[PDB]
Amino acid sequence: PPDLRPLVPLDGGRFATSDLNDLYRRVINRNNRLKRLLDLAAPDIIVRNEKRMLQEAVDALLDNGRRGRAITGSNKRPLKSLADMIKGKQGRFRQNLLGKRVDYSGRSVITVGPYLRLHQCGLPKKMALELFKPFIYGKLELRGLATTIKAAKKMVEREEAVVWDILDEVIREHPVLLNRAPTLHRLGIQAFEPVLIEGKAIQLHPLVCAAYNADFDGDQMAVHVPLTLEAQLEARALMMSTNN
Amino acid sequence: RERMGHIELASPTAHIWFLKSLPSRIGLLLDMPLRDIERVLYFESYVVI
Amino acid sequence: AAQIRQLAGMRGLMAKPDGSIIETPITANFREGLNVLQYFISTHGARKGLADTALKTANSGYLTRRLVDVAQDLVVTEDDCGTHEGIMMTPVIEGGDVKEPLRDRVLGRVTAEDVLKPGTADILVPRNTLLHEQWCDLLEENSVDAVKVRSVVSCDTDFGVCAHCYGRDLARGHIINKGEAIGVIAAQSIGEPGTQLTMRTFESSIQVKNKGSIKLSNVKSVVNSSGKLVITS
Amino acid sequence: MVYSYTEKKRIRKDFGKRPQVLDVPYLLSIQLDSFQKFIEQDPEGQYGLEAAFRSVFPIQSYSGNSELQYVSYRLGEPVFDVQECQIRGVTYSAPLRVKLRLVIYEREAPEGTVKDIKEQEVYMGEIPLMTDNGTFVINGTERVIVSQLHRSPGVFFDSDKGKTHSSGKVLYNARIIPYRGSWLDFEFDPKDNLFVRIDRRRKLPATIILRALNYTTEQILDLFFEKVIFEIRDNKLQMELVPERLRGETASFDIEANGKVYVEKGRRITARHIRQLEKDDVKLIEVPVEYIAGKVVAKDYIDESTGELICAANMELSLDLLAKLSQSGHKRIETLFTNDLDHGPYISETLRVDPTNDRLSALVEIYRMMRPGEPPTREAAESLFENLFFSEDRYDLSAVGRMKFNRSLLREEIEGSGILSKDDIIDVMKKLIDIRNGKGEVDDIDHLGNRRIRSVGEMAENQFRVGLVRVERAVKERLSLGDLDTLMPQDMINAKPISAAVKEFFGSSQLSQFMDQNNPLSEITHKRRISALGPGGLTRERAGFEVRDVHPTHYGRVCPIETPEGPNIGLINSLSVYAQTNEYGFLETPYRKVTDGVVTDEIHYLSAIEEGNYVIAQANSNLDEEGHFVEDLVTCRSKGESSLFSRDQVDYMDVSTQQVVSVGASLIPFLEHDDANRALMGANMQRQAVPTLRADKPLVGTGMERAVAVDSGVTAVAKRGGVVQYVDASRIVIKVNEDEMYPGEAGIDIYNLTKYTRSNQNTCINQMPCVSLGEPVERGDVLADGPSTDLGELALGQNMRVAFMPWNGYNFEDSILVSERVVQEDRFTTIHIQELACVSRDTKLGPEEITADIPNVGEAALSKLDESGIVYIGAEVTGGDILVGKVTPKGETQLTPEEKLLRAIFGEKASDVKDSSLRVPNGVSGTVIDVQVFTRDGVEKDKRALEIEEMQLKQAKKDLSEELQILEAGLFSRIRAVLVAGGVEAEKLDKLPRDRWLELGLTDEEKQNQLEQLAEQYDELKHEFEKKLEAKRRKITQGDDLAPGVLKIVKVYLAVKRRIQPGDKMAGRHGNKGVISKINPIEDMPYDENGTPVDIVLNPLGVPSRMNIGQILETHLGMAAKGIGDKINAMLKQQQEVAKLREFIQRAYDLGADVRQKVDLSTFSDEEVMRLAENLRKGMPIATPVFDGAKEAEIKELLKLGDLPTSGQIRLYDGRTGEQFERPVTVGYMYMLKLNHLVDDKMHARSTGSYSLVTQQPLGGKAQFGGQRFGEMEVWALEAYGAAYTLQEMLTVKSDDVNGRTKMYKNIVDGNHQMEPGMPESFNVLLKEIRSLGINIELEDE
Amino acid sequence: YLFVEFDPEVIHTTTINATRGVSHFVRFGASPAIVPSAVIHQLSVYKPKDIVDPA
RNA sequence: UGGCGGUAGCGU
DNA sequence: GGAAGATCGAAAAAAGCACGCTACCGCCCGCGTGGT
DNA sequence: ACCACGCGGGCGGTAGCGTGCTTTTTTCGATCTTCC
Ligand SMILES: [Zn+2]
């Protein structure tokens, strides 16, 4: 389908063409030439050569570089054929199926919070506001402060005091998942109770650093927000720092 | 995102997944060497039927 | 001890990249000043370690990925296999030093069959009991070394393993629950310490260092002219 | 010594015991000189464009009548300078104009004499020029070409460790590597034969190439193997015998000469037997008949009676063959001497295996292997073999390649031909055979003598040669096709291929890297970098352990400390301080020659190969007077090892202790007390420092800061000495001295300091004036300090009060606690400049234009914009504001009466023009500081561009007016003196204007003649200045070249003042790094007895673990320096007399233990002492050399000089409680750096944003506002926990379920936490992909 | 498509492959294909046809 | 506001 | 007692080479045409 | 002279381009070795 091979505009009057479209165009042109020459009563040698070219074009489309010389585009690199972007590290299996980008996520450096409890983690107020935006909108609609989603959008943008109170109330005991980039074992991702802090750095419990293999040398940590009752109970019971 | 097209090839072409992925499926089925299949597919030698 | 020794004492011998030991060691303290030659000599080990870590992280990650794949579909799906066959577990001793004792090796595991008291033909533990700390202490009090314990490799359950044949959860006092993804946990546990490892490529008689009796296994021998025994096995 | 003017302001105390003999050379000399060799005219054709032109030109077509020759080349004057190219975005380059002569011979004349000649100059593209700072300006961007470490051309011998066949037998190989041509390889096999491989293709027997070289079988046998002659004597066929040939073989027969049995049959030969045989001088001996049969026959023998070959070459003989030869009448035969211990029959075995028989068969086989599928013919095979190695056009061995080839073969001729010869191949094969036998040793690939450095010049020359040969073949075809009479050189050649190749090399090459601009040290390190990566080099993954290691030959050439950590470990290195490149390309180091036990001051540059032969003493060797060594035994490096040697065996000594380390590593004080890993990471990290608001000099330094600051182009350096006539924050005008006057010029020079210009890393570049009005200056002095530079000294950080102690866990594990006073004083506040670009192009419907009027926007949004449509300069802007208003036509247009009539009617033509105004990105705030407008020719210019042009013209007019004012003042003084020489007219002249002075005339004499001559000179000078101003105005108003389609570009610069905050990355110079944890109040930090609180608190727990003791020593030294500065400030506060200040400063400077530096304050004129004390009021800088720094005794003495404890630890009180601390803590002053890793820059948080259009997944990256990626190990960790609902929510609801996303959003808005699984879109994409691959895949419902 | 008559021993195949304008030899397998003389003879004379292919 | 390639860097 | 199954090492083809993140650059057919 | 597209495909050449891994799997000259 064309949507699986989109023609993204380049914002300069040109269209970026994917490798699949170019390979399909090559195959179509070769097939049309073969049909035209067959209708022309061409000699046996020419027909055989055209059939061989059609076979090679189909070969390049199905799996480029499998046999002979890999077909190269304007970049002087082999084209990403149909099977090229299925297998490998960049294939659909290992890039869009096993692991995928998710919403309601943030990332920042980690500092040491000595006052934090074992089940608590310091979260910046900006992250709490941005990540819990749908929850803030729902609470604002329930309280009657705003009548529509747009009014809640303006209220959140303007940073009203009622917005801050709503943010404090709605994330009072909503667990969040903290994860480090080299997640070796299951302890690399753990649930924590957010505590509103100022600044721009996530505060981490000193005790959990050993299990996290976490370094206050500038390491970066990511935070995700469970957003259903099942996930909230699951993080509270199975993945909280007090349960490990 | 769902509708798919089709192209009517002038002449049949084999699938390389069953031809070059060792062991060759056509060669195993027909009990012929892989190079014979490669030669006949790439228009090198006539094959009796 | 090594780091403080390097700080206040001599740095000791250093090794060239080929692995050979340099005749002249570094006799300068970190508190004192190291000349250019000593620093140039010492840089070799640091460079080797950094390169080893850099080129070993990827290998460890690949091994962890393969291990987590090979056991991704293994979960607990039963409570008891009923099999009376298990692995024969004894403490491991290498040379003149005991590597791992029985108590730590069989902690949090279930016996495949009832272990009897040595020499009395009296049962010491039940057939299907889980060996916790008290059971291990009782077993070691009676000087027991050989125990038949149920193992995952002998789990008779198909399309998964049974809770009993696995053992303790190793993270909670109770036994393993039903439905836990033991395969992923095991693979991650094996693959995590891969970084701690290293990728670096580098007697005519027996001695006794303790007091005790001597026992022989798989032996046929003969007495020599002087009377000393010589083994023919 | 006489201190320089900039040095007299603030002299840094030096603690170096060793006296320096050689000054630090220019750091960038590796680059600039190289580029000179690429552009300087060369009388002989071996370097630069001249060599390429001589290699390519001349040309002869298929018809000999036509010819084209090259005369000379000239580099044109660049249109714009560095600054104009940088601002305008054009590439800094110069035209390349070459003189070409087209000669048409007389076709009718058989001898082909000249008939017509046409000489003309032709332009063949723009060659990019490289700035005086060692950088390139490509497409308006600053790029740097790094050197490449590559295997040198020549013959290299290698031997694998026997793992190939897995029995311990090693397979030797010899590789011939030309600069340009076909790599050749000779390899051994387990069967002990020789195989030749060309370009890593199929192996062939090595004798094939010898046969193809017109060598017969017998010639090869004689050349590769010695022969033993067996002659038919009266009986037993006595042979000439050499005793040494009998070593190591069992006596198969009794040996006897002159009737004396030396040994009998069946007994092993002994060395005593060999010596006895040599003493006997035996030349003839008896031979059993069976002994000859074991040997093989070398020369084929034929008999005239039989007419057939009884024997041939190279096969095993036998008894029947021996009898046939004996009866044939032949009496003399020659056999091979085969001894398995030392002379293996590898050549004979290879020849037996070889199926070729003559030259034609070998050539046919070589052609078939070279080009499979082509018909083997005699002429084609001959041509291919001749061109493979014996053609200068195809095979080219460089001069360094020839030198290495001759050195490895032990030939005494360094110079030689650039092509291979038969003798060279024969010698290579013989050397390989000798290596296999045991004689000699294999070469080391990691040896620095086998690795060459290719600079920018060599790669540029290679790319130029490629373009030149392309244009050469193109011009060959054009000349052959075209009509000779009417062909002109300009249209004859095409500059497209050469220009394209040059542009691609300069812009898109792997080694053409974006130059960093964090600090001058980073730029210096980047310029002086050697990378094995690149074309014809090692790959990141396929590197191996061995190459990344530090070879012993790296001493003095490549520092072992400064190298990137991670994937690029051991592959990227930095040049040493004294390292330099030889003419061949090998690195060399300076050394001091030691003769007769004394160390002379003369220096010699020894390369890597020559270093091994001699023995060199270490730099840290004590020397008494006359240069004798105090110790009987000195440590030395003789052959890749360190050992003790006697005093009189030394031949060379290291120049300085900084030779081993690089410039970046040498900047770290107390390096000898730092661990190798910590020092490595500190040296790497120093390049990431960001300049602060105010540059603060390092209290503890290494003395190399001045060299780094001066060598870098960040600071302004006075080209000529003089006095500062005019000093200003914008420009500095200096009147040069009478001694240094260039003839025929005004005598003033103007420096325009760059101000608040964005760097490559979005960092502000600020140049601040240093000198004052009337202050004399001299050549080489610093006039204005660049970024992170103080008084001509590089300063990447600030001196802060540091106390080592845990503080309530806020310093847990390398965390840093920062007092509020740091934020209050803006010590580490930084400025960041960001670029925002708006493009107005020509669309199909209609061209877009910038206008103030924008649809459906409030007046508040348009308030920031001007009438033209661009935000005012200096206006504070935030996220969502409109910096520039742009509207694009849509739907319909070209209806102006309706537009005028309906400008505000309810239709408002909203669909006709849609808003496309550039807006500030969300989360970005700052102040607009610069606006640039670029407009293509033929398009009406807006008023803002007119104002920018008027400002530029005003600046140029001001400079030209200053110059003209100086010149006219001089000329009018001259004319006044001339008039006074005649009619004085003093009273009226004082009352008369100078142009009325020109108006006045004198009587007819020589005075009137010179008066009118001076008037003519005056008007000529005025006209010349008018022409110069007109040219400058024309250059300013010249239109800018834009991309096809865009007609205007607007660039806006936003300045952001970033202050320190928790989460920012801070660190020192010893590799200790951390993140700010809490901005503690000033009243909470611990304070001393005097009540002064500390600024930074560091955790001591990190000191013993990393073994970086140097930071503690630096802290103690900084404490001592700050105590000295405190004493100076105290004596300055009492208004004490200059005598006491002089005495105290002299006492402070004279402290030490036989330091090389001596300071005499008696020659400071009693006035510069006050300035020095004012500069030293903050503190006294101390220069601590790298490996020759101050000891503990000197530090303790310096501390005792001030009123400070000798132990370096004081008593502190807790700020909050006020109670005494149980133990004294270590306080002092430490140099802290702010890294380029800001916490606010790492901020990223997304709840619901844009999604990819192919996989329906959230985007990635902070700029694109995308969520974080849940990796595979994250899924595995969730599975280990037993997480199922959370995993499903992560995989479907949050990422791919398009319906699920909307349902969940509407549920959360409604307050219900209900989840719908749906089905991921990526699974459907995969299903469609597999279906399109001809493979059925469907979901089975039942 | 272009038919070429020449002797390989006079002009080598590599030279023809390097001729300007010619892309590559029509080769089946390693060796270039040889056109039989009958095909050339039949294509030289009566191969052209007045039938219009583009409709 | 889409990706590909190259380069450099951060964290292990 | 010269051929057919075994094999044996030697050569050749194929697949994989940790994860997150940040910034910059360049590039997003390509040249040979046809009407004006 | 620029502006726009339209059929093709490695490139420019009257040839040749590559050139520092390891492990697994497949095939084949060539023996070999056992014997039909
Ligand atoms: Zn079981």
Side-chain angles (χ1 to χ4, degrees), chain C residues 80-81 150-151 154-157 161-166:
Chain C
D80 203 313
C81 268
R150 276 154 88 163
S151 169
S154 182
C155 214
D156 259 325
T157 284
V161 314
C162 94
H164 268 74
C165 270
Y166 178 74

PDB file of all heavy atoms in Angstrom, chain C residues 80-81 150-151 154-157 161-166, ligand 1:
ATOM      1  N   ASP C  80       3.359 -29.646  41.198  1.00  0.00           N
ATOM      2  CA  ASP C  80       4.144 -30.818  41.564  1.00  0.00           C
ATOM      3  C   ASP C  80       4.222 -31.767  40.379  1.00  0.00           C
ATOM      4  O   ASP C  80       3.192 -32.143  39.813  1.00  0.00           O
ATOM      5  CB  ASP C  80       3.537 -31.532  42.776  1.00  0.00           C
ATOM      6  CG  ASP C  80       4.551 -32.372  43.526  1.00  0.00           C
ATOM      7  OD1 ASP C  80       5.303 -33.126  42.873  1.00  0.00           O
ATOM      8  OD2 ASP C  80       4.598 -32.277  44.770  1.00  0.00           O
ATOM      9  N   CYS C  81       5.446 -32.147  40.009  1.00  0.00           N
ATOM     10  CA  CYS C  81       5.635 -33.115  38.934  1.00  0.00           C
ATOM     11  C   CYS C  81       5.338 -34.535  39.397  1.00  0.00           C
ATOM     12  O   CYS C  81       4.806 -35.343  38.626  1.00  0.00           O
ATOM     13  CB  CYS C  81       7.064 -33.032  38.397  1.00  0.00           C
ATOM     14  SG  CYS C  81       7.278 -31.906  37.013  1.00  0.00           S
ATOM     15  N   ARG C 150      15.482 -32.163  43.500  1.00  0.00           N
ATOM     16  CA  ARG C 150      14.780 -31.977  42.238  1.00  0.00           C
ATOM     17  C   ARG C 150      15.347 -30.776  41.492  1.00  0.00           C
ATOM     18  O   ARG C 150      15.654 -29.741  42.087  1.00  0.00           O
ATOM     19  CB  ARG C 150      13.283 -31.794  42.481  1.00  0.00           C
ATOM     20  CG  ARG C 150      12.521 -33.100  42.621  1.00  0.00           C
ATOM     21  CD  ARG C 150      11.263 -32.926  43.453  1.00  0.00           C
ATOM     22  NE  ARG C 150      10.124 -32.523  42.639  1.00  0.00           N
ATOM     23  CZ  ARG C 150       8.859 -32.607  43.030  1.00  0.00           C
ATOM     24  NH1 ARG C 150       8.534 -33.073  44.224  1.00  0.00           N
ATOM     25  NH2 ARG C 150       7.897 -32.212  42.201  1.00  0.00           N
ATOM     26  N   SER C 151      15.484 -30.923  40.176  1.00  0.00           N
ATOM     27  CA  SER C 151      16.083 -29.897  39.338  1.00  0.00           C
ATOM     28  C   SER C 151      15.151 -29.563  38.183  1.00  0.00           C
ATOM     29  O   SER C 151      14.281 -30.352  37.808  1.00  0.00           O
ATOM     30  CB  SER C 151      17.446 -30.340  38.795  1.00  0.00           C
ATOM     31  OG  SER C 151      17.905 -29.454  37.789  1.00  0.00           O
ATOM     32  N   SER C 154      15.215 -31.888  35.244  1.00  0.00           N
ATOM     33  CA  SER C 154      14.459 -33.118  35.426  1.00  0.00           C
ATOM     34  C   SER C 154      12.966 -32.867  35.601  1.00  0.00           C
ATOM     35  O   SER C 154      12.233 -33.793  35.962  1.00  0.00           O
ATOM     36  CB  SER C 154      15.000 -33.897  36.626  1.00  0.00           C
ATOM     37  OG  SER C 154      14.305 -35.120  36.793  1.00  0.00           O
ATOM     38  N   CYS C 155      12.505 -31.643  35.359  1.00  0.00           N
ATOM     39  CA  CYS C 155      11.093 -31.317  35.515  1.00  0.00           C
ATOM     40  C   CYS C 155      10.277 -32.053  34.457  1.00  0.00           C
ATOM     41  O   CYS C 155      10.476 -31.850  33.256  1.00  0.00           O
ATOM     42  CB  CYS C 155      10.889 -29.808  35.402  1.00  0.00           C
ATOM     43  SG  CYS C 155       9.570 -29.125  36.432  1.00  0.00           S
ATOM     44  N   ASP C 156       9.359 -32.911  34.905  1.00  0.00           N
ATOM     45  CA  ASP C 156       8.560 -33.718  33.991  1.00  0.00           C
ATOM     46  C   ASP C 156       7.425 -32.942  33.338  1.00  0.00           C
ATOM     47  O   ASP C 156       6.828 -33.443  32.379  1.00  0.00           O
ATOM     48  CB  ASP C 156       7.989 -34.933  34.724  1.00  0.00           C
ATOM     49  CG  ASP C 156       8.768 -36.201  34.443  1.00  0.00           C
ATOM     50  OD1 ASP C 156       9.262 -36.357  33.307  1.00  0.00           O
ATOM     51  OD2 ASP C 156       8.888 -37.043  35.358  1.00  0.00           O
ATOM     52  N   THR C 157       7.109 -31.747  33.830  1.00  0.00           N
ATOM     53  CA  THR C 157       6.041 -30.950  33.241  1.00  0.00           C
ATOM     54  C   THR C 157       6.419 -30.525  31.827  1.00  0.00           C
ATOM     55  O   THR C 157       7.543 -30.072  31.582  1.00  0.00           O
ATOM     56  CB  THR C 157       5.759 -29.724  34.110  1.00  0.00           C
ATOM     57  OG1 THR C 157       5.022 -30.122  35.274  1.00  0.00           O
ATOM     58  CG2 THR C 157       4.955 -28.685  33.343  1.00  0.00           C
ATOM     59  N   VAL C 161       7.489 -25.619  33.483  1.00  0.00           N
ATOM     60  CA  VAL C 161       8.055 -26.334  34.618  1.00  0.00           C
ATOM     61  C   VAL C 161       7.081 -26.249  35.783  1.00  0.00           C
ATOM     62  O   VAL C 161       6.192 -25.395  35.823  1.00  0.00           O
ATOM     63  CB  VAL C 161       9.438 -25.787  35.036  1.00  0.00           C
ATOM     64  CG1 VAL C 161      10.324 -25.572  33.819  1.00  0.00           C
ATOM     65  CG2 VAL C 161       9.282 -24.499  35.825  1.00  0.00           C
ATOM     66  N   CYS C 162       7.254 -27.158  36.734  1.00  0.00           N
ATOM     67  CA  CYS C 162       6.432 -27.176  37.932  1.00  0.00           C
ATOM     68  C   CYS C 162       7.078 -26.340  39.032  1.00  0.00           C
ATOM     69  O   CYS C 162       8.289 -26.106  39.041  1.00  0.00           O
ATOM     70  CB  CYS C 162       6.215 -28.609  38.416  1.00  0.00           C
ATOM     71  SG  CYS C 162       7.394 -29.156  39.662  1.00  0.00           S
ATOM     72  N   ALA C 163       6.241 -25.880  39.965  1.00  0.00           N
ATOM     73  CA  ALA C 163       6.735 -25.036  41.048  1.00  0.00           C
ATOM     74  C   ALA C 163       7.703 -25.794  41.948  1.00  0.00           C
ATOM     75  O   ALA C 163       8.733 -25.249  42.360  1.00  0.00           O
ATOM     76  CB  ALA C 163       5.564 -24.487  41.861  1.00  0.00           C
ATOM     77  N   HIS C 164       7.387 -27.050  42.267  1.00  0.00           N
ATOM     78  CA  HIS C 164       8.244 -27.822  43.160  1.00  0.00           C
ATOM     79  C   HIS C 164       9.604 -28.091  42.530  1.00  0.00           C
ATOM     80  O   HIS C 164      10.644 -27.890  43.166  1.00  0.00           O
ATOM     81  CB  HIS C 164       7.557 -29.133  43.542  1.00  0.00           C
ATOM     82  CG  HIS C 164       6.758 -29.048  44.805  1.00  0.00           C
ATOM     83  ND1 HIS C 164       5.547 -28.396  44.877  1.00  0.00           N
ATOM     84  CD2 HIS C 164       6.999 -29.532  46.047  1.00  0.00           C
ATOM     85  CE1 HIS C 164       5.074 -28.482  46.108  1.00  0.00           C
ATOM     86  NE2 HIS C 164       5.936 -29.167  46.837  1.00  0.00           N
ATOM     87  N   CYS C 165       9.620 -28.526  41.267  1.00  0.00           N
ATOM     88  CA  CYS C 165      10.877 -28.896  40.626  1.00  0.00           C
ATOM     89  C   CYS C 165      11.814 -27.708  40.448  1.00  0.00           C
ATOM     90  O   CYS C 165      13.006 -27.909  40.191  1.00  0.00           O
ATOM     91  CB  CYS C 165      10.601 -29.555  39.271  1.00  0.00           C
ATOM     92  SG  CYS C 165      10.399 -31.356  39.333  1.00  0.00           S
ATOM     93  N   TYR C 166      11.310 -26.480  40.579  1.00  0.00           N
ATOM     94  CA  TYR C 166      12.165 -25.305  40.452  1.00  0.00           C
ATOM     95  C   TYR C 166      12.891 -25.002  41.758  1.00  0.00           C
ATOM     96  O   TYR C 166      14.125 -25.010  41.813  1.00  0.00           O
ATOM     97  CB  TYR C 166      11.336 -24.097  40.005  1.00  0.00           C
ATOM     98  CG  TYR C 166      12.131 -22.815  39.902  1.00  0.00           C
ATOM     99  CD1 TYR C 166      13.022 -22.611  38.859  1.00  0.00           C
ATOM    100  CD2 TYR C 166      11.987 -21.808  40.847  1.00  0.00           C
ATOM    101  CE1 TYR C 166      13.749 -21.441  38.758  1.00  0.00           C
ATOM    102  CE2 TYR C 166      12.710 -20.635  40.754  1.00  0.00           C
ATOM    103  CZ  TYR C 166      13.589 -20.457  39.709  1.00  0.00           C
ATOM    104  OH  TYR C 166      14.312 -19.290  39.613  1.00  0.00           O
TER     105      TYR C 166
HETATM  106 ZN    ZN I   1       8.645 -30.398  38.142  1.00  0.00          ZN
END
